[PDB]
Design a protein around this motif. Structure first.
Motif, PDB file in Angstrom:
ATOM      1  N   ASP A  89       9.376 -42.669 -15.419  1.00  0.00           N
ATOM      2  CA  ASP A  89       8.185 -43.217 -16.045  1.00  0.00           C
ATOM      3  C   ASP A  89       7.659 -44.406 -15.253  1.00  0.00           C
ATOM      4  O   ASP A  89       8.430 -45.239 -14.767  1.00  0.00           O
ATOM      5  N   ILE A  90       6.332 -44.491 -15.153  1.00  0.00           N
ATOM      6  CA  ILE A  90       5.708 -45.509 -14.315  1.00  0.00           C
ATOM      7  C   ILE A  90       5.955 -46.905 -14.880  1.00  0.00           C
ATOM      8  O   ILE A  90       6.328 -47.826 -14.145  1.00  0.00           O
ATOM      9  N   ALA A  91       5.767 -47.084 -16.189  1.00  0.00           N
ATOM     10  CA  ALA A  91       5.866 -48.420 -16.773  1.00  0.00           C
ATOM     11  C   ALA A  91       7.260 -49.009 -16.593  1.00  0.00           C
ATOM     12  O   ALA A  91       7.404 -50.207 -16.319  1.00  0.00           O
ATOM     13  N   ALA A  92       8.299 -48.186 -16.740  1.00  0.00           N
ATOM     14  CA  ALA A  92       9.669 -48.660 -16.604  1.00  0.00           C
ATOM     15  C   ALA A  92      10.081 -48.883 -15.156  1.00  0.00           C
ATOM     16  O   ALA A  92      11.147 -49.461 -14.914  1.00  0.00           O
ATOM     17  N   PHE A  93       9.278 -48.443 -14.199  1.00  0.00           N
ATOM     18  CA  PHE A  93       9.639 -48.605 -12.799  1.00  0.00           C
ATOM     19  C   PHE A  93       9.446 -50.058 -12.387  1.00  0.00           C
ATOM     20  O   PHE A  93       8.388 -50.638 -12.658  1.00  0.00           O
ATOM     21  N   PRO A  94      10.434 -50.682 -11.759  1.00  0.00           N
ATOM     22  CA  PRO A  94      10.267 -52.063 -11.256  1.00  0.00           C
ATOM     23  C   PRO A  94       9.485 -52.124  -9.946  1.00  0.00           C
ATOM     24  O   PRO A  94      10.025 -52.268  -8.848  1.00  0.00           O
ATOM     25  N   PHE A  95       8.163 -52.011 -10.060  1.00  0.00           N
ATOM     26  CA  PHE A  95       7.302 -52.131  -8.892  1.00  0.00           C
ATOM     27  C   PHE A  95       7.391 -53.530  -8.311  1.00  0.00           C
ATOM     28  O   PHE A  95       7.324 -54.522  -9.042  1.00  0.00           O
ATOM     29  N   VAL A  96       7.544 -53.605  -6.987  1.00  0.00           N
ATOM     30  CA  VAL A  96       7.368 -54.876  -6.293  1.00  0.00           C
ATOM     31  C   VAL A  96       5.974 -55.420  -6.559  1.00  0.00           C
ATOM     32  O   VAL A  96       5.776 -56.631  -6.708  1.00  0.00           O
ATOM     33  N   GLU A  97       4.989 -54.529  -6.630  1.00  0.00           N
ATOM     34  CA  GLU A  97       3.629 -54.865  -7.036  1.00  0.00           C
ATOM     35  C   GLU A  97       3.188 -53.822  -8.051  1.00  0.00           C
ATOM     36  O   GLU A  97       3.012 -52.650  -7.705  1.00  0.00           O
ATOM     37  N   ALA A  98       3.022 -54.244  -9.298  1.00  0.00           N
ATOM     38  CA  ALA A  98       2.694 -53.307 -10.354  1.00  0.00           C
ATOM     39  C   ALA A  98       1.241 -52.849 -10.240  1.00  0.00           C
ATOM     40  O   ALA A  98       0.376 -53.602  -9.787  1.00  0.00           O
ATOM     41  N   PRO A  99       0.949 -51.611 -10.640  1.00  0.00           N
ATOM     42  CA  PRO A  99      -0.451 -51.177 -10.736  1.00  0.00           C
ATOM     43  C   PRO A  99      -1.109 -51.705 -12.001  1.00  0.00           C
ATOM     44  O   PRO A  99      -0.598 -52.640 -12.626  1.00  0.00           O
ATOM     45  N   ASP A 100      -2.232 -51.114 -12.397  1.00  0.00           N
ATOM     46  CA  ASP A 100      -2.957 -51.527 -13.592  1.00  0.00           C
ATOM     47  C   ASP A 100      -2.669 -50.546 -14.719  1.00  0.00           C
ATOM     48  O   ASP A 100      -2.890 -49.341 -14.567  1.00  0.00           O
ATOM     49  N   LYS A 101      -2.197 -51.069 -15.852  1.00  0.00           N
ATOM     50  CA  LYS A 101      -1.729 -50.209 -16.935  1.00  0.00           C
ATOM     51  C   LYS A 101      -2.869 -49.478 -17.632  1.00  0.00           C
ATOM     52  O   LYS A 101      -2.646 -48.417 -18.223  1.00  0.00           O
ATOM     53  N   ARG A 102      -4.086 -50.024 -17.589  1.00  0.00           N
ATOM     54  CA  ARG A 102      -5.214 -49.340 -18.214  1.00  0.00           C
ATOM     55  C   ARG A 102      -5.488 -48.005 -17.541  1.00  0.00           C
ATOM     56  O   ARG A 102      -5.858 -47.027 -18.203  1.00  0.00           O
ATOM     57  N   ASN A 103      -5.309 -47.947 -16.226  1.00  0.00           N
ATOM     58  CA  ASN A 103      -5.511 -46.712 -15.490  1.00  0.00           C
ATOM     59  C   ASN A 103      -4.324 -45.762 -15.595  1.00  0.00           C
ATOM     60  O   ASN A 103      -4.407 -44.642 -15.079  1.00  0.00           O
ATOM     61  N   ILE A 104      -3.231 -46.173 -16.245  1.00  0.00           N
ATOM     62  CA  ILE A 104      -2.088 -45.277 -16.410  1.00  0.00           C
ATOM     63  C   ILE A 104      -2.454 -44.116 -17.322  1.00  0.00           C
ATOM     64  O   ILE A 104      -2.265 -42.946 -16.969  1.00  0.00           O
ATOM     65  N   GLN A 105      -2.982 -44.419 -18.510  1.00  0.00           N
ATOM     66  CA  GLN A 105      -3.381 -43.352 -19.422  1.00  0.00           C
ATOM     67  C   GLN A 105      -4.519 -42.518 -18.845  1.00  0.00           C
ATOM     68  O   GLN A 105      -4.618 -41.320 -19.135  1.00  0.00           O
ATOM     69  N   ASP A 106      -5.374 -43.124 -18.014  1.00  0.00           N
ATOM     70  CA  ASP A 106      -6.451 -42.374 -17.377  1.00  0.00           C
ATOM     71  C   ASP A 106      -5.948 -41.464 -16.263  1.00  0.00           C
ATOM     72  O   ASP A 106      -6.625 -40.485 -15.925  1.00  0.00           O
ATOM     73  N   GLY A 107      -4.787 -41.761 -15.688  1.00  0.00           N
ATOM     74  CA  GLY A 107      -4.200 -40.878 -14.703  1.00  0.00           C
ATOM     75  C   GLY A 107      -3.534 -39.689 -15.357  1.00  0.00           C
ATOM     76  O   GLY A 107      -3.685 -38.546 -14.905  1.00  0.00           O
ATOM     77  N   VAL A 108      -2.784 -39.959 -16.430  1.00  0.00           N
ATOM     78  CA  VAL A 108      -2.164 -38.886 -17.201  1.00  0.00           C
ATOM     79  C   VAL A 108      -3.222 -37.893 -17.660  1.00  0.00           C
ATOM     80  O   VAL A 108      -3.076 -36.678 -17.486  1.00  0.00           O
ATOM     81  N   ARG A 109      -4.314 -38.402 -18.237  1.00  0.00           N
ATOM     82  CA  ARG A 109      -5.389 -37.531 -18.698  1.00  0.00           C
ATOM     83  C   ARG A 109      -5.874 -36.618 -17.582  1.00  0.00           C
ATOM     84  O   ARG A 109      -5.988 -35.400 -17.762  1.00  0.00           O
ATOM     85  N   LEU A 110      -6.137 -37.193 -16.405  1.00  0.00           N
ATOM     86  CA  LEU A 110      -6.672 -36.406 -15.300  1.00  0.00           C
ATOM     87  C   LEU A 110      -5.675 -35.354 -14.838  1.00  0.00           C
ATOM     88  O   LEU A 110      -6.039 -34.196 -14.613  1.00  0.00           O
ATOM     89  N   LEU A 111      -4.405 -35.735 -14.693  1.00  0.00           N
ATOM     90  CA  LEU A 111      -3.387 -34.736 -14.393  1.00  0.00           C
ATOM     91  C   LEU A 111      -3.308 -33.678 -15.486  1.00  0.00           C
ATOM     92  O   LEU A 111      -2.999 -32.515 -15.201  1.00  0.00           O
ATOM     93  N   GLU A 112      -3.592 -34.054 -16.739  1.00  0.00           N
ATOM     94  CA  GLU A 112      -3.604 -33.071 -17.821  1.00  0.00           C
ATOM     95  C   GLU A 112      -4.845 -32.191 -17.755  1.00  0.00           C
ATOM     96  O   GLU A 112      -4.761 -30.979 -17.984  1.00  0.00           O
ATOM     97  N   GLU A 113      -6.010 -32.780 -17.460  1.00  0.00           N
ATOM     98  CA  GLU A 113      -7.198 -31.964 -17.232  1.00  0.00           C
ATOM     99  C   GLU A 113      -6.989 -31.020 -16.057  1.00  0.00           C
ATOM    100  O   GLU A 113      -7.455 -29.875 -16.076  1.00  0.00           O
ATOM    101  N   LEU A 114      -6.269 -31.477 -15.036  1.00  0.00           N
ATOM    102  CA  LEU A 114      -6.079 -30.729 -13.803  1.00  0.00           C
ATOM    103  C   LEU A 114      -4.915 -29.753 -13.867  1.00  0.00           C
ATOM    104  O   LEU A 114      -4.610 -29.113 -12.853  1.00  0.00           O
ATOM    105  N   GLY A 115      -4.266 -29.620 -15.023  1.00  0.00           N
ATOM    106  CA  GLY A 115      -3.135 -28.722 -15.148  1.00  0.00           C
ATOM    107  C   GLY A 115      -1.946 -29.112 -14.306  1.00  0.00           C
ATOM    108  O   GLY A 115      -1.064 -28.281 -14.068  1.00  0.00           O
ATOM    109  N   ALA A 116      -1.898 -30.363 -13.841  1.00  0.00           N
ATOM    110  CA  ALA A 116      -0.801 -30.799 -12.986  1.00  0.00           C
ATOM    111  C   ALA A 116       0.471 -31.042 -13.789  1.00  0.00           C
ATOM    112  O   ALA A 116       1.568 -30.696 -13.337  1.00  0.00           O
ATOM    113  N   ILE A 117       0.347 -31.630 -14.972  1.00  0.00           N
ATOM    114  CA  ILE A 117       1.495 -31.824 -15.846  1.00  0.00           C
ATOM    115  C   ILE A 117       1.301 -31.042 -17.134  1.00  0.00           C
ATOM    116  O   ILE A 117       2.218 -30.371 -17.597  1.00  0.00           O
TER     117      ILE A 117
END
Length: 736
Positions: free
Chosen positions: A437-465
């Motif tokens: 899971d992305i949130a639990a990953f200890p990123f040296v530099e974290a991404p933006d959490k607002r775009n996390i749900q927007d990435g999941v959605r797109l992968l879901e629209e795209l049949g990737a996950i």
């Protein structure tokens, strides 16, 4: 006799990889009831453990005599570093240029007693770089390839059991996590060139921190250039940093900026002439793309310069060709490279460099919501690394094809790749490696959490996950382009339109090559109007591509650049287009996907595109004006689109951009009947008004993100509601 505990001690003197299997076996002896059989199995296990402990002793006896270079570049700090590593679990060793860090740190570990029960793993960003470091260390220790030094550059390669030091790329070490999450094969892990901060480095730095409590025996160190070595120390709870003074002799910097007849390579040409007046030293020229390298190597060869060998360094080159880059070279050698040359391994006798100061950099457009490869000015840190390739007692010159104020206007550092990549790709890739899971990953530099749900959605629209990776998600993450575009490429396999899709998706990954300057607006517009299509902006990409390849055959390389200036086409981006298209065509054919030979039809290409833009559909009002898009959002077609003057009822756009209002860029007319098959995972069926007609008929309404691809279709309602149709049927069939 033998006791359970007695054999656990023998495990503590084994190689780590061999401990787990024997441990599982010792526990299984507890089931055995006959005590004679237990001691019988114990004795055989002890003879098997003896051999495994013999492997450690054999490895520990075959340790060579460690030698450190006479030049004392880091050898003085080598005494200092051995103190640093042994005491702390994490040490960060900053360096500069060829300080010799890369080649001495595995040696430093080997002398510290490490490398015996586990491997000394050492990563590099590139296959070539890893292979040369191994060959470099093997000769310095007088070791042949089967000896204690090896390298692994392809995931299906293997190293000998005598290997004590393993050299690989980051992608390989990630691949190995899947089948060895504890990473038991290694007792030391060196991460090199970490200043680059790509995804593989950040994924590896995060995962190693997550692993470090579960592996207190593991010692890891991070080698890097002097680019902010502090942040790595903050990543781990505490981390001592050591800075190695790389002895660099002076280099001279000359700023030579440039402002229809002029050639694009002309600045390059004059810079090599400038260098020619000084000496016949070897020149390194950093460039953007491989086709630009080809176009320059061809132009420098037609010059027929005196006693000069032009060596273009591509990634496709055979290893026999890359070894040629290190040969004696009697005459002058002009090496043309990309950022691959910015890695620690250097061409031996480089005296001058030529730096255009530009590099193709993966960056996500927040404005148009896509991952692009724009060519842009490199940063100060990148530029100083390019000039740092003049490192030698002999005085060298660096020529920067830009003004000094430019270099000081640029940002100080390049953005880490984690902060300029859309999270869908970030998610899609750590899912593919098992990073979790992305949130639990200890990123040296974290991404933006607002775009996390927007990435999941797109992968879901795209049949990737958490989530799982569908088989087309696996294919999606093996593609250099944006997932939206990657999805179109895969769907083109079914419609036989893969060529068109590879042209379009590579075209949409770059800034548009069709220039339009203010002095030449009517003329550039007139030129671009040649390729426009009546019902699809996308087809303008296919028209221009087929044309640029038609003239590329008919014209010389020189006359081609001339054509670009004449037809108002940015030459650099026309070449990036081909570069991406080719790199795309290589991964596509590495997979089972064919490539066509005949032009596909309008519906075949646009259904493929549609699978990537399902959220980008819209249907027009009856007011002959705006469109209704996903989630009750409205928009208008961008002026200058081929569809702008005759907008269709159902549109498909590549970009929704909000300035004065929400606009739709790169539009194409679709048939809403096409949406239904490629939308099964998203449609919302709704039924209403069931009635008995001479069974029970209802009216079906189908929506994708709230839009009515099927307004109302009469269907048999017996499957949707058995009870109602059973009741109504009884009354009518009898009355009949």
């Amino acid at each position: 006799k033998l006791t359970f505990t007695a054999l656990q001690q023998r495990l503590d003197s084994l190689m780590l990889r061999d401990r787990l299997r024997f441990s599982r076996r010792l526990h299984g002896v507890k089931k055995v009831k006959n005590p004679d059989a237990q001691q019988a199995i114990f004795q055989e296990m002890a003879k098997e453990i003896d051999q495994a402990a013999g492997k450690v002793l054999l490895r520990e006896a075959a340790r060579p005599e460690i030698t450190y270079p006479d030049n004392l570049p880091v050898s003085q700090k080598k005494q200092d570093i051995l103190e640093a590593i042994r005491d702390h679990q994490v040490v960060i060793v900053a360096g500069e240029t060829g300080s010799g860090k890369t080649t001495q740190l595995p040696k430093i570990c080997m002398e510290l007693g490490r490398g015996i029960k586990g491997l000394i793993g050492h990563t590099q960003p590139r296959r070539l770089a890893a292979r040369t470091v191994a060959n470099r260390i093997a000769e310095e220790l007088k070791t042949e390839p089967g000896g204690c030094i090896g390298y692994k550059v392809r995931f299906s390669d293997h190293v000998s059991d005598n290997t004590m030091v393993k050299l690989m790329t980051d992608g390989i070490l990630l691949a190995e996590i899947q089948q060895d999450r504890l990473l038991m094969q290694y007792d030391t892990i060196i991460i090199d060139e970490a200043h680059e901060r790509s995804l593989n480095i950040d994924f590896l730095l995060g995962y190693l921190k997550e692993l470090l409590p579960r592996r207190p025996d593991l010692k890891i160190i991070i080698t890097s250039a002097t680019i902010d070595p502090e942040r790595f120390s903050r990543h781990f709870n505490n981390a001592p940093i050591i800075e190695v003074s790389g002895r660099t002799y002076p280099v001279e910097v000359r700023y030579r900026p440039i402002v229809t007849e002029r050639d694009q390579l002309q600045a390059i040409f004059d810079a090599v002439d400038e260098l020619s007046q000084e000496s016949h030293g070897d020149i390194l020229i950093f460039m953007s793309g491989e086709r630009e390298i080809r176009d320059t190597a061809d132009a420098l060869n037609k010059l027929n310069l005196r006693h000069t060998e032009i060596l273009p360094l591509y990634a496709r080159l055979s290893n026999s060709e890359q070894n040629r880059v290190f040969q004696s070279h009697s005459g002058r050698r002009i090496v043309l490279a990309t950022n691959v040359a910015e890695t620690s391994l250097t061409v031996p006798g480089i005296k001058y460099v030529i730096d255009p100061g530009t590099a193709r950099i993966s960056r996500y457009s927040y404005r148009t919501k896509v991952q692009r490869l724009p060519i842009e000015p490199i940063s100060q840190a990148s530029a100083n690394q390019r000039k740092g390739r003049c490192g030698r007692v002999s005085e060298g010159i660096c020529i920067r094809l830009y003004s000094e104020d430019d270099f000081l206007s640029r940002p100080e550092f390049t953005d880490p790749e984690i902060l300029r990549t859309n999270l869908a790709s970030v998610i899609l890739q750590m899912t593919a490696l098992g990073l979790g899971d992305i949130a639990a990953f200890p990123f040296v530099e974290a991404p933006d959490k607002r775009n996390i749900q927007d990435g999941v959605r797109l992968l879901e629209e795209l049949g990737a996950i958490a989530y799982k990776l569908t088989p087309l998600g696996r294919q999606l993450s093996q593609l250099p382009v944006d997932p939206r575009l990657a999805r179109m490429v895969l769907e083109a396999q079914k419609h036989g339109c893969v060529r068109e899709a590879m042209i379009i998706t590579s075209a949409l990954s770059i800034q548009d090559p069709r220039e339009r300057p203010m002095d030449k607006q009517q003329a550039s517009d007139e030129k671009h109007r040649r390729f426009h299509d009546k019902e699809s902006d996308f087809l303008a990409f296919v028209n221009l591509w087929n044309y640029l390849g038609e003239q590329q055959k008919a014209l010389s390389s020189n006359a081609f650049r001339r054509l670009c200036r004449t037809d108002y086409l940015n030459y650099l981006r026309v070449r990036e287009w081909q570069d991406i298209y080719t790199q795309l065509r290589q991964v596509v054919k590495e997979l089972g996907i064919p490539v066509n030979s005949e032009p596909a039809e309008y519906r075949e290409i646009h259904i493929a595109l549609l699978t990537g833009l399902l959220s980008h559909i819209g249907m027009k009002d009856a007011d002959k004006q705006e469109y209704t898009g996903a989630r009750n959002a409205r928009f208008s077609i961008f002026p200058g689109s081929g569809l702008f003057k005759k907008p269709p009822k159902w549109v498909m756009v590549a970009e929704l951009v909000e300035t004065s209002r929400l606009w739709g860029r790169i539009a194409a007319r679709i048939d809403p009947e096409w949406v239904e098959p490629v939308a099964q995972h998203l449609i919302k069926r709704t039924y209403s008004e069931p009635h008995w007609e001479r069974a029970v008929m209802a009216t079906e309404k189908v929506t994708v993100y709230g839009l009515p691809i099927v307004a109302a279709r009469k269907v048999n309602y017996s499957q949707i509601d058995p009870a109602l149709c059973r009741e109504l049927f009884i009354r009518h069939a009898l009355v009949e």
